[PDB]
Amino acid sequence: VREPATEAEAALCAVYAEVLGLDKVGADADFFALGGDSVLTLRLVHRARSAGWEISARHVFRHPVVADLAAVAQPVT
């Protein structure tokens, strides 16, 4: 399983695992391949912000892989 290589990747890995109910998730994990849907996307957006990273639901649907999602995130102001 692929370790995160940036702070944003590491935060999103942890949030993916928490939202999807998994123990740990790799930096190459696909949110919808792992069981994501509209409800869980909503939760991912909220919990990512709590972890310091601003994303949208549209970001998740367009970039469901952790590493790709981390690249469009913005740090919370």
Author numbering: 3521 to 3597
Study text:
Given that the PCP2 and PCP3 domains of the fuscachelin NRPS are highly similar (65% sequence identity), and that PCP domains can act as both aminoacyl donors and acceptors for C domains, we rationalized that the arrangement observed in our structure is a valid model of an acceptor-PCP-bound C domain. Importantly, the residues at the interface with the C domain are conserved or highly similar. Furthermore, computational docking of the PCP3 domain onto the acceptor-PCP binding site of the C3 domain showed that it binds in an almost identical orientation to the PCP2 domain in the structure of the PCP2-C3 didomain.
